[PDB]
Amino acid sequence: VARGWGRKCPLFGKNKSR
Prior knowledge:
Layout: no helix or strand
PDB class: antimicrobial protein
Keywords: structure from cyana 2.1, VR18, Antimicrobial peptide, Pseudomonas aeruginosa LPS bicelle, antimicrobial protein
Assembly: monomeric
């Protein structure tokens, strides 16, 4: 889904740990 691309996503949501 397109709801876990922020933090729920590792290499896709790495921005969560910017």
